């Protein structure tokens, strides 16, 4: 029951209740760089709580070494210890990951867990 390892319902809680006290366990589905200019690179993530995916996660730049040294990568399972929500002028919300711990490496997990569907914001 691999989905029992993920905080099912955390994405809805973040995006509907603005709950930032939870420390949810999520799976990275994908990571890619965001287009940037003359600045530190920035990374965006598609994350899963087992029920939903959400593509609006951004890594704080202080966490860039986790991506660049390949510890945070697609399929890994991580616990979010500190995050903030930012709401854009157009109404869409971005979740900025400030502190996280990788609980299980991508190589130890190996696959997308469950069948999460995109969150309807």
């Amino acid at each position: 029951h691999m989905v029992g390892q993920l905080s099912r319902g955390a994405i809805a809680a973040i995006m509907q209740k603005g709950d930032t006290n939870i420390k949810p366990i999520l799976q990275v589905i994908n990571i890619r760089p965001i287009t940037t200019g003359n600045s530190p690179p920035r990374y965006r993530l598609l994350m899963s709580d087992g029920l939903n995916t959400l593509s609006s996660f951004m890594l704080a730049t202080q966490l860039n070494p986790l991506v660049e040294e390949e510890q945070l990568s697609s399929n890994c399972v991580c616990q979010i210890h500190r995050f903030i929500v930012n709401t854009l002028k157009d109404g869409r919300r971005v979740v900025i990951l400030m502190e996280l711990e990788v609980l299980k490496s991508a190589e130890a997990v190996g696959v997308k867990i469950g069948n999460p569907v995109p969150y309807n914001e």
């Binding site: 940037t36 920035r42 951004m58 869409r92 971005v94």
Partner: peptide
């Protein structure tokens, strides 16, 4: 879904 040019603003 949010484009790169808007996600960082």
């Amino acid at each position: 879904e949010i484009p790169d040019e808007l996600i960082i603003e």
